[PDB]
Coordinates of C-alpha atoms in Angstrom, one line a residue:
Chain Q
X60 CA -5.0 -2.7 41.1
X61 CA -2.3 -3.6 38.6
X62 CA 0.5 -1.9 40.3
X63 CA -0.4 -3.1 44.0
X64 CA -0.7 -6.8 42.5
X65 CA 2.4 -6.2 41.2
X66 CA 0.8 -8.2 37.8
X67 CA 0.9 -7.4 34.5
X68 CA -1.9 -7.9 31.9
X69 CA -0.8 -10.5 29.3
X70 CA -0.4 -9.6 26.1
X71 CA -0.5 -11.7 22.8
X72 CA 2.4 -13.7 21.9
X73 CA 0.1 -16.3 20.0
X74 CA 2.1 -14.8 16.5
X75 CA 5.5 -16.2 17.6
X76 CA 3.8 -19.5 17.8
X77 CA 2.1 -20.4 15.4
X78 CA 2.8 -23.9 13.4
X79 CA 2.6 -25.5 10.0
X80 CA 0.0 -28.0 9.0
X81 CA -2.8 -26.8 11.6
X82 CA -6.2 -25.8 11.3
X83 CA -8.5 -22.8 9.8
X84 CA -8.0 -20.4 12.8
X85 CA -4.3 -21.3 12.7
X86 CA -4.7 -20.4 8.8
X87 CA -5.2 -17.0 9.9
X88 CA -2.6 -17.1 12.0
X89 CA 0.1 -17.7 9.3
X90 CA -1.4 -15.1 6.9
X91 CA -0.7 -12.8 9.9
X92 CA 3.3 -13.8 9.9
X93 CA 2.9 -13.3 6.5
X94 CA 1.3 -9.5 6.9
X95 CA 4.0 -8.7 9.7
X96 CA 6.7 -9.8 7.6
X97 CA 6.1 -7.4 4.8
X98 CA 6.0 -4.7 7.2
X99 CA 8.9 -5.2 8.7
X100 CA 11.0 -5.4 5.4
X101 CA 9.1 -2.0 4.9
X102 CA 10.0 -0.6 8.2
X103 CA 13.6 -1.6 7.7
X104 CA 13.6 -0.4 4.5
X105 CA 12.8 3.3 5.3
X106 CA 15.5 2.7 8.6
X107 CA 17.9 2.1 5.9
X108 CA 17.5 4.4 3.4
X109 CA 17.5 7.4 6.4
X110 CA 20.8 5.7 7.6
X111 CA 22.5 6.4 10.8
X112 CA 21.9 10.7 10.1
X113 CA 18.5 10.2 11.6
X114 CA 19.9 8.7 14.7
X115 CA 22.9 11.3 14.5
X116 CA 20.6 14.3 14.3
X117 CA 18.5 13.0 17.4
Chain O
X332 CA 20.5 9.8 -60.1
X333 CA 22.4 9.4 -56.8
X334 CA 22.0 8.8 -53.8
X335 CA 24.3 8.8 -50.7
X336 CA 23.3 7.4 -47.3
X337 CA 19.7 7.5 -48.2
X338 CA 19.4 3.3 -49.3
X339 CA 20.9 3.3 -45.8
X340 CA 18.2 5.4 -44.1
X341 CA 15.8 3.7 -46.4
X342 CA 16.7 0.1 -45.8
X343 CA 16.5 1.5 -41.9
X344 CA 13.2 2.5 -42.3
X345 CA 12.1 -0.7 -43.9
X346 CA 13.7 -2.5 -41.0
X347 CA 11.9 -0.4 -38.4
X348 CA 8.6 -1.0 -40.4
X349 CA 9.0 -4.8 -40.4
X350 CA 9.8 -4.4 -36.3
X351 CA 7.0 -2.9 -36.1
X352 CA 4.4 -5.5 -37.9
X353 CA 5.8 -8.1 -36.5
X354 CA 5.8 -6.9 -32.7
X355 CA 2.6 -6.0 -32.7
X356 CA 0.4 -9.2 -34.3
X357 CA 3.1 -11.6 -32.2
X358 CA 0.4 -12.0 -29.4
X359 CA -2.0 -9.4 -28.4
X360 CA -2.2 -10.4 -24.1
X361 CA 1.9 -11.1 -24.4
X362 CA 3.1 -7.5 -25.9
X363 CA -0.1 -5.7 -23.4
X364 CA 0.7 -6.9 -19.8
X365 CA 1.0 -9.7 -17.7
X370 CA 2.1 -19.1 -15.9
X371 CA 3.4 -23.1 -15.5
X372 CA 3.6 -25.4 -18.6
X373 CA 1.5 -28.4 -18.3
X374 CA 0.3 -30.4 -21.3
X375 CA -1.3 -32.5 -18.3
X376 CA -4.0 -29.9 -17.3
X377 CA -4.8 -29.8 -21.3
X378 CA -5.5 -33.5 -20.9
X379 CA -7.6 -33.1 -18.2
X380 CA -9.6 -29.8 -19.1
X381 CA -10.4 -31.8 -22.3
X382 CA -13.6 -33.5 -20.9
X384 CA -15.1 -27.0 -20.7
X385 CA -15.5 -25.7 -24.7
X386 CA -14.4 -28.7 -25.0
X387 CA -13.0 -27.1 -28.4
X388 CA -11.9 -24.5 -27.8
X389 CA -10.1 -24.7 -25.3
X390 CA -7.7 -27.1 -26.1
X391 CA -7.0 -24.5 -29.1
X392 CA -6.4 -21.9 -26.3
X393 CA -3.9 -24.4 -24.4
X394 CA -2.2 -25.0 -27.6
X395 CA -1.7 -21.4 -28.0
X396 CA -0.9 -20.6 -24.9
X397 CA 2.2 -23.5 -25.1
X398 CA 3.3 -22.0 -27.8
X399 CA 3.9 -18.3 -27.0
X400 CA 5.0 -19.3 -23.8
X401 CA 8.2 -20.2 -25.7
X411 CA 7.8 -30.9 -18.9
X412 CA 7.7 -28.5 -22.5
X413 CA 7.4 -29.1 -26.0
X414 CA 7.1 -26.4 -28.4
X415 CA 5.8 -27.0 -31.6
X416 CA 3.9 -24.5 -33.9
X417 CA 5.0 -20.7 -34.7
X418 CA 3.4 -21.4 -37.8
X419 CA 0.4 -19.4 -36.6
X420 CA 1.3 -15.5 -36.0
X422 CA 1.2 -12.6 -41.6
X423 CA -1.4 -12.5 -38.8
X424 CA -1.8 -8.8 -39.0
X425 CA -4.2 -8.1 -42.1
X426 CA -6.4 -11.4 -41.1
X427 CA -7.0 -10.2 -37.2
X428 CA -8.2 -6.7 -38.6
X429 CA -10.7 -7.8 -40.9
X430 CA -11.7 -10.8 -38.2
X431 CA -11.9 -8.0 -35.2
X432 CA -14.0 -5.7 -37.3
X433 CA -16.4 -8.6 -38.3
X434 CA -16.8 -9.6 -35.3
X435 CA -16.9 -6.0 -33.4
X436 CA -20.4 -5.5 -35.7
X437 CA -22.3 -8.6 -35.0
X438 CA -21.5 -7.6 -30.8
X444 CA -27.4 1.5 -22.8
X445 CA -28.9 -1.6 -22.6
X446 CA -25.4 -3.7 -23.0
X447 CA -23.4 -1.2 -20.4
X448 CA -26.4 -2.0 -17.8
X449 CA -26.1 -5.6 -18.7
X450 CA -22.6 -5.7 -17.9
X451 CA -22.7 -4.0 -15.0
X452 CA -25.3 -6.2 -13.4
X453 CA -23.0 -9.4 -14.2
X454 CA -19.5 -7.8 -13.2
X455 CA -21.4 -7.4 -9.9
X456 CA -22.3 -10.8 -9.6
X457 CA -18.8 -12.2 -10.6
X458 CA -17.4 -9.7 -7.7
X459 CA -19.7 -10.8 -5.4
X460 CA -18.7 -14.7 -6.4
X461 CA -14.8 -13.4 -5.5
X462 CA -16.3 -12.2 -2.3
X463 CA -17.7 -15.2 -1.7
X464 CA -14.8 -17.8 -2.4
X465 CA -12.5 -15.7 0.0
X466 CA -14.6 -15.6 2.8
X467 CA -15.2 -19.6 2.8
X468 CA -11.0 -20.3 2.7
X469 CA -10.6 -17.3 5.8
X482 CA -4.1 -28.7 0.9
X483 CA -4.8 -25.2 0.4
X484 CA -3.2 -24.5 3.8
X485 CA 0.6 -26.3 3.1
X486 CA 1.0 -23.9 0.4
X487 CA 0.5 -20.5 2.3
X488 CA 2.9 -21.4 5.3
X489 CA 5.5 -22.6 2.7
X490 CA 5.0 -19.0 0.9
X491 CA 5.1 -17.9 4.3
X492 CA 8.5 -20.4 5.2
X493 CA 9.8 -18.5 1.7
X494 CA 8.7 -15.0 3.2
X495 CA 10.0 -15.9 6.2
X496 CA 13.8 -17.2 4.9
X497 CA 14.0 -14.4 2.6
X498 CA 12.6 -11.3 4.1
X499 CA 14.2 -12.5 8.2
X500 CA 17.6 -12.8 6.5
X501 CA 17.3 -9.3 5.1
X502 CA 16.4 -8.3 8.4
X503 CA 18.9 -9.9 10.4
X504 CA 21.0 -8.0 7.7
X505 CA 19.9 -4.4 7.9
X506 CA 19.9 -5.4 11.3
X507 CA 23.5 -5.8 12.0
X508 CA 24.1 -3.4 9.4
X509 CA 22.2 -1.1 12.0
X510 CA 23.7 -2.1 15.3
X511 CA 26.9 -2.1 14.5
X512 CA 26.2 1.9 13.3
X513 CA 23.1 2.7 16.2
X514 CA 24.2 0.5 19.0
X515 CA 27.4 3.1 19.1
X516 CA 25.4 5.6 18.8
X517 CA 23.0 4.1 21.0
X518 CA 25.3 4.0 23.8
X519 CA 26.3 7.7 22.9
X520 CA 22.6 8.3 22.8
X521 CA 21.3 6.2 26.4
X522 CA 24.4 7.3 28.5
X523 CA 23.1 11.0 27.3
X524 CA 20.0 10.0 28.4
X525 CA 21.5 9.1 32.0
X526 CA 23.2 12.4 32.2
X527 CA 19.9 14.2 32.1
X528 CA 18.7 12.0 35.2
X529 CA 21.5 12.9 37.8
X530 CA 21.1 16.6 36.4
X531 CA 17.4 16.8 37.1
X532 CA 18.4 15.4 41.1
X533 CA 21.5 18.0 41.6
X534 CA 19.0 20.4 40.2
X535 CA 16.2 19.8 42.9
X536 CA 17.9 19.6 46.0
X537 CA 19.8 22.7 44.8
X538 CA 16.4 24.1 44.4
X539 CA 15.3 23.2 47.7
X540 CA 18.5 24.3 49.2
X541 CA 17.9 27.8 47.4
Chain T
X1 CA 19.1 24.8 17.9
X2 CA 19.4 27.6 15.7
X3 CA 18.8 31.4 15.5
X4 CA 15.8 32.4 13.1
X5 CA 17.9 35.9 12.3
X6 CA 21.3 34.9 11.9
X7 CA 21.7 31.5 11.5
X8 CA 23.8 30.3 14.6
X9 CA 23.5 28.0 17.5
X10 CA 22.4 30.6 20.3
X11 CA 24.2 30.6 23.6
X12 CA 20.9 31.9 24.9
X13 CA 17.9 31.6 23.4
X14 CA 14.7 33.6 24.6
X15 CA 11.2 32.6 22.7
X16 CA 8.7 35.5 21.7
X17 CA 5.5 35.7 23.1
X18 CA 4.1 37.2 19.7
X19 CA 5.3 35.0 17.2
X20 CA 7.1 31.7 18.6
X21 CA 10.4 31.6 17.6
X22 CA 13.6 30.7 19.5
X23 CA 15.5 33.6 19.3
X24 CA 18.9 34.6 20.6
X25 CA 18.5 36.8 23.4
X26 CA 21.9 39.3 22.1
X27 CA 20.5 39.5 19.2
X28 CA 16.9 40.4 19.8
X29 CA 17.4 42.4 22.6
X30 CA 19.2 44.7 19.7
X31 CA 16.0 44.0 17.2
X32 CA 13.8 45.6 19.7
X33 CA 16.6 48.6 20.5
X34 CA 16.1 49.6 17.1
X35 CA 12.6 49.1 16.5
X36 CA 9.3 47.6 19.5
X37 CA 9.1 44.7 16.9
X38 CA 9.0 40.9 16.3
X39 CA 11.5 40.5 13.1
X40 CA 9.5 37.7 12.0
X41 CA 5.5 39.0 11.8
X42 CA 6.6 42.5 12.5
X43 CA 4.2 42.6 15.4
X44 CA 4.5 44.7 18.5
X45 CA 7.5 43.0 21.0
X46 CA 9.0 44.6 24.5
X47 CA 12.1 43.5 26.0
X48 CA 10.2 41.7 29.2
X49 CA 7.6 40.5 27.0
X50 CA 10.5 38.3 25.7
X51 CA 11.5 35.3 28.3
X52 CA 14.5 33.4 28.6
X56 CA 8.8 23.7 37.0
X57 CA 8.7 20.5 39.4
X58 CA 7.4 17.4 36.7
X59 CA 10.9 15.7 35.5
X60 CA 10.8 14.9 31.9
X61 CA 12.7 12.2 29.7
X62 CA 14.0 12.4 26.4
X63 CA 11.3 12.2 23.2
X64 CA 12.0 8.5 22.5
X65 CA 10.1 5.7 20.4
X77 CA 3.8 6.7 25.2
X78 CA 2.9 9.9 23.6
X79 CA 5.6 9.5 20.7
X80 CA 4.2 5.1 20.3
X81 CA 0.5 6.4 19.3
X82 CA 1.4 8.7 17.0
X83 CA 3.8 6.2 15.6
X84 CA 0.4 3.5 15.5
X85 CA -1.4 6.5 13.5
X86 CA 1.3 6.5 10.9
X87 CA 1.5 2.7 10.4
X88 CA -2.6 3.0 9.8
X89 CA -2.5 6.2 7.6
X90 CA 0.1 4.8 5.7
X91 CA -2.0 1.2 5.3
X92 CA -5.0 3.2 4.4
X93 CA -3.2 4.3 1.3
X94 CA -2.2 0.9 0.5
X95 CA -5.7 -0.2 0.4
X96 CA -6.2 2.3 -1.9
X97 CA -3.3 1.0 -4.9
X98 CA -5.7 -1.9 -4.5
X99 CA -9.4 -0.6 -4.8
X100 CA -8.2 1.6 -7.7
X101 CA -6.9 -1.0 -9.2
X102 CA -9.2 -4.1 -8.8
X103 CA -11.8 -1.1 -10.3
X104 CA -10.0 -0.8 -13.4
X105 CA -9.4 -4.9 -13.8
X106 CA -13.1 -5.7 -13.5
X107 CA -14.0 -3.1 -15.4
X108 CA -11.6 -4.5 -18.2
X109 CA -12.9 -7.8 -17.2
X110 CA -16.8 -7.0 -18.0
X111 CA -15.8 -5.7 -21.4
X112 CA -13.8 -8.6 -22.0
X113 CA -16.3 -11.1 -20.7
X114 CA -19.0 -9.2 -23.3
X115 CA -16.7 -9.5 -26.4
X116 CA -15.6 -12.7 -25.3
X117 CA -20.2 -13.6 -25.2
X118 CA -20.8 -12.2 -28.4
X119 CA -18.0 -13.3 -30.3
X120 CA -18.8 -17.1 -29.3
X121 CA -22.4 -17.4 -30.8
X122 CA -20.0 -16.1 -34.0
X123 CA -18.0 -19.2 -33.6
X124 CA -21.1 -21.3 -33.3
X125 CA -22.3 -20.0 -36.4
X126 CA -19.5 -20.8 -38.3
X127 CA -19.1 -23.8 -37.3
X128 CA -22.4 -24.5 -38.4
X129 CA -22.2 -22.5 -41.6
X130 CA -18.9 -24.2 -42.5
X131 CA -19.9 -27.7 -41.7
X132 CA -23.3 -26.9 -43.5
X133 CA -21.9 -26.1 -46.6
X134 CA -20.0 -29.0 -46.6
X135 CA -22.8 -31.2 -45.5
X136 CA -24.5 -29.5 -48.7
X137 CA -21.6 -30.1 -51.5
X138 CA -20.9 -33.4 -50.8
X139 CA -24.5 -34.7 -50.8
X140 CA -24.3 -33.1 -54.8
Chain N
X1 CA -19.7 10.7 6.0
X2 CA -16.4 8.7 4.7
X3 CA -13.4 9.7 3.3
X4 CA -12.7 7.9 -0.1
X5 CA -9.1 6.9 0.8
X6 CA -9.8 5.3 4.1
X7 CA -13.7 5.1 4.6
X8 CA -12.5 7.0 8.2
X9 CA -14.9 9.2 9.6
X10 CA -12.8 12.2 9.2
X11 CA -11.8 14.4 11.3
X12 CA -10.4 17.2 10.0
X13 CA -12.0 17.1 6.1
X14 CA -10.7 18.3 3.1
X15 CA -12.6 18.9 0.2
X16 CA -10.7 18.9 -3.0
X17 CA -11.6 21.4 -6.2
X18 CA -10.8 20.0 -9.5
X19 CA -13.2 16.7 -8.1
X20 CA -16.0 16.9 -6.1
X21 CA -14.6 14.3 -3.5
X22 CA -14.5 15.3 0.7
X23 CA -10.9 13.8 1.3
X24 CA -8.9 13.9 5.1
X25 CA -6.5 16.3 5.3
X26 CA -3.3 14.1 6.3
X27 CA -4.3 11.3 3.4
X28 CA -4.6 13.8 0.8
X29 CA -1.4 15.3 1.5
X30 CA 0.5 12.1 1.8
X31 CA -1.1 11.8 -1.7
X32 CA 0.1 14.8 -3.0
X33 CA 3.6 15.0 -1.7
X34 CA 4.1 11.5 -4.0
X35 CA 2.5 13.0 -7.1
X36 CA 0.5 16.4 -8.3
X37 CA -2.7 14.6 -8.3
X38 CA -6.1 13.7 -7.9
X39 CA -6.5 10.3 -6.7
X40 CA -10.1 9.8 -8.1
X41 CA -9.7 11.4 -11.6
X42 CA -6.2 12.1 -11.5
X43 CA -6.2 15.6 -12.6
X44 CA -4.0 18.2 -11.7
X45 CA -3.7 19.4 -8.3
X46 CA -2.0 20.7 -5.5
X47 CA -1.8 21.5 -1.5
X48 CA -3.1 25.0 -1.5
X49 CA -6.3 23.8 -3.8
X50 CA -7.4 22.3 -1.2
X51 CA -10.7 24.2 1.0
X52 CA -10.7 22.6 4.2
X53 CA -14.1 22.0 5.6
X57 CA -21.1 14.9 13.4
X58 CA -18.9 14.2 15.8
X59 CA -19.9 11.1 18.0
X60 CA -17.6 10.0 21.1
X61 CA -17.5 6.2 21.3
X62 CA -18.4 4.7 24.8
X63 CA -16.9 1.3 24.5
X64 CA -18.3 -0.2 27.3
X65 CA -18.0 -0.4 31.2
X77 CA -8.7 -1.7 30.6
X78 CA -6.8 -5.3 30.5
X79 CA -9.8 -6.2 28.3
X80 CA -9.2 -3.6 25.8
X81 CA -5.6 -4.2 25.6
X82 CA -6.4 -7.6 23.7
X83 CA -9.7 -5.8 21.8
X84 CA -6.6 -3.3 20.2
X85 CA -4.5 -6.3 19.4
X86 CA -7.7 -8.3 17.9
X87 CA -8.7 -5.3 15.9
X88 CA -4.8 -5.1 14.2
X89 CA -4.9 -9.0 13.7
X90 CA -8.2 -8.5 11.4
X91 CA -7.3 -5.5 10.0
X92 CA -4.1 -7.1 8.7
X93 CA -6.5 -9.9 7.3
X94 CA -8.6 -7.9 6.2
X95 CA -6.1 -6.2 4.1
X96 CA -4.1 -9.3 3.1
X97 CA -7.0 -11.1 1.4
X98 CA -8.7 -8.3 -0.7
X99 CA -4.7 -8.3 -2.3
X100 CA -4.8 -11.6 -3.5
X101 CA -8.2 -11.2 -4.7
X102 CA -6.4 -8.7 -6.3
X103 CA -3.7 -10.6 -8.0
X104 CA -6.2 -13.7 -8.9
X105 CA -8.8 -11.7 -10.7
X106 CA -6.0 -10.2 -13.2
X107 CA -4.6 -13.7 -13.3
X108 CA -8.1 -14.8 -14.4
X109 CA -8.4 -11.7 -16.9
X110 CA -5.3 -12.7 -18.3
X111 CA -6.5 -16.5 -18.9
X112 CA -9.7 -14.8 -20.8
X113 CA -7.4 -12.6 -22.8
X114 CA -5.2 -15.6 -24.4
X115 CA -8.3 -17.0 -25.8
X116 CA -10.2 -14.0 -26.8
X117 CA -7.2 -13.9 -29.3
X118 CA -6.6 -17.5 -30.0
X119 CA -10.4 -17.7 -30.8
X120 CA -10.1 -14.6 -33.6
X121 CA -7.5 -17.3 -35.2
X122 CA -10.2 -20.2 -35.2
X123 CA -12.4 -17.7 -37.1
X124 CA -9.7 -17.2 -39.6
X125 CA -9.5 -21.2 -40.7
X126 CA -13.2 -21.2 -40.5
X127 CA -14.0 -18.5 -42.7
X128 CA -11.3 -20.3 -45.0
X129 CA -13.3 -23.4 -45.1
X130 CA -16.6 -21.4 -45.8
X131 CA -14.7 -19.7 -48.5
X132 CA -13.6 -22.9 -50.2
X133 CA -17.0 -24.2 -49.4
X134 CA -18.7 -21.0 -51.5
X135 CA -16.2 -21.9 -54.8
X136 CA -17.2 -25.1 -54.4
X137 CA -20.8 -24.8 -54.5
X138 CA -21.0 -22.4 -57.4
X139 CA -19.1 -25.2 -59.6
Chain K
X52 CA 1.6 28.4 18.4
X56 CA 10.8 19.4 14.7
X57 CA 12.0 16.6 17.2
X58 CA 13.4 13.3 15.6
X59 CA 13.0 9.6 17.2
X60 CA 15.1 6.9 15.9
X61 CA 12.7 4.0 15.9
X62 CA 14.7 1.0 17.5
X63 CA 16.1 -1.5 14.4
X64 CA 13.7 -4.1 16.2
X65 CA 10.8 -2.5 15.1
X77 CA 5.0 -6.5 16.9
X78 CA 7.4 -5.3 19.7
X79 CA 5.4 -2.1 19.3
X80 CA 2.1 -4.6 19.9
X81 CA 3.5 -6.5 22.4
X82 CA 6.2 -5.4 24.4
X83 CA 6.9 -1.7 24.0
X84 CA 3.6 -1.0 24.7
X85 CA 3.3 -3.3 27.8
X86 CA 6.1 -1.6 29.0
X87 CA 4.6 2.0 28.6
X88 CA 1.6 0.7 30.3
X89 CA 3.9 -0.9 33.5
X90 CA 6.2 2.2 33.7
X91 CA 3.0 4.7 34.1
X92 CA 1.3 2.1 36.5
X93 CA 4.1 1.3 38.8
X94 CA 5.6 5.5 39.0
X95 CA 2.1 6.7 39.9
X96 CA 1.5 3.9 43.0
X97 CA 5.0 4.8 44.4
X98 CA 4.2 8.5 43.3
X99 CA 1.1 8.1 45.6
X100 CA 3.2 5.7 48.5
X101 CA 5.6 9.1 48.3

């Protein structure tokens, strides 16, 4: 059904925007920024530390 | 009679001993493991102990060092404490069962006070706004660090890729021409 | 990529059906010459039982390769619930025993303050 | 039933020997690879220690829909990891607060038991 | 009875849109797979 629609289900981009001084669900919603930011340092920190080798080995 | 670099060794020794006494009764939570100086929360906690606790804010101002710093005419400490720790440890199955029971209420009162919060909600996008300066700017960093080492070996890696795609079609009609 | 006996890059590998290894076929064609054997389990290997469709593949790249990726962000997260539980059990367990001293060192101090203020409620009346 | 790193139902179980404590094989050797240890009672031990030893499908319900039940779950399990840390961190904040005047209060006892002693010399003359 | 990815540098893409994209990809192939 998806393919002969052509469509695409939607997926949540609700994380890019999010916005200060809002209310308790939106409270949740910058802890989450908060959660995904620490995870990306982390998974830029192992990408780093492997350097380019791992992409030279591939 | 005569010594020789032994009142050296000695006076050494004497040093190290007095390093020692006096690193240990400095502060016992300080020198064990790991806060804002505000003599106006003192003021207004003073309406608690309501005794004690303003002897607990003055000590805590003071090894600490809006700030004034005062009195490190407090901590020769170290004979007093012992004899006040052993006092007091005498006077203090039953007891392990009774502490159990109330560290399992005071977890379920931090159990509580998190669910209700899931003012207070400025401060966390700020920390987030910090999070969010700092940790973005070391990603835009290792980033461009990145691309400008993967993107060339991107390029040798995608091109690769496209290689594999027009050998995969000369190999099938070659197969169907076999 | 390489040769399990001698190291190389083989020019053309053939994989065992006894124990799966990518051999190179120049060199294991002389292995089993000299003895009907797999050099790596020693198990019984012929010449034809060594080997050199129509689905097209692509390149192992970051669907298959994205949910075992997933499973290594949660496995990894898993542990780092763990720093905490270990953690929070050794803080409230230093907490109770602090919380106790701190209870029965308190009626001390309201004993002494009562002794002490006593005493001189007593000497100054004489 | 749970494995007492993640609470998973596991699926390939490890049991290890020098605690008695059913483990998942891929946690456990996460674990290990770090450091030579136990995680519960942190005694020595190692990858080949390790004896490896109720299986229910789940039918979800009667596909776009559990695209966005994935990305819910994620959203509370990052939640749900970010506020037991700072529960974490405030509860050793709070221990520390109780530590500072378990130790200024020893000192109060010291001046006390100073005027009780003056107090004793006192009434005896 | 080991192959290497380099995870992209832009590593919630993997929420969002890699995984959309994995999704597309194996709907749209199969339909024209099925219309060959």
């Amino acid at each position: 059904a998806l393919y002969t629609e052509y469509l695409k289900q939607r997926n949540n981009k609700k994380r890019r925007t999010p916005d200060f001084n809002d209310d308790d669900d939106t409270l949740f919603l910058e802890e989450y920024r908060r959660k995904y930011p620490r995870i990306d340092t982390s998974r830029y920190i192992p990408n780093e530390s492997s350097e380019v080798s791992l992409l030279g080995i591939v | 009679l005569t010594p020789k670099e032994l009142l050296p060794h000695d006076s050494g020794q004497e040093d190290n001993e007095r390093s020692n006494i006096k690193s240990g009764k400095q502060l016992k939570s300080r020198i064990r493991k790991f806060f804002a100086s505000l003599p106006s929360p003192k003021n207004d906690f003073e309406i608690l102990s309501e005794d004690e606790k303003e002897e607990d804010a003055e000590i805590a101002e003071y090894e600490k060092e809006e700030d004034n710093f005062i009195e490190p005419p407090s901590q020769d400490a170290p004979r007093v404490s012992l004899v006040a720790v052993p006092l007091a440890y005498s006077t203090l199955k039953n007891n392990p069962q009774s502490a159990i029971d109330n560290k399992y209420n005071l977890l379920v009162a931090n159990a509580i006070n998190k669910e209700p919060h899931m003012e207070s909600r400025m401060q966390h996008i700020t920390q987030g706004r910090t999070s969010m300066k700092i940790q973005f700017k070391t990603a835009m960093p290792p980033t461009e660090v990145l691309l400008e080492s993967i993107q060339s070996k991107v390029e040798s890696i995608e091109q690769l890729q496209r290689k594999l795609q027009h050998v995969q079609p000369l190999e099938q009609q070659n197969n169907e021409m076999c | 990529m390489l040769c399990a006996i001698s190291g190389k890059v083989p020019r053309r590998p053939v994989l065992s059906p006894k124990s799966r290894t990518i051999f190179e076929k120049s060199l294991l064609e002389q292995y089993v010459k000299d003895t009907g054997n797999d050099p790596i389990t020693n198990e019984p290997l012929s010449i034809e039982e060594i080997v050199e469709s129509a689905q097209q593949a692509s390149l192992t790249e970051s669907i298959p390769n994205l949910l075992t990726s997933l499973q290594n962000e949660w496995d990894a997260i898993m542990l780092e619930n763990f720093k905490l539980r270990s953690t929070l059990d050794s803080l409230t367990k230093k907490l109770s025993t602090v919380m106790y001293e701190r209870d029965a060192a308190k009626l001390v101090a309201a004993q002494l303050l009562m002794e002490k203020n006593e005493d001189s409620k007593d000497l100054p009346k004489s």
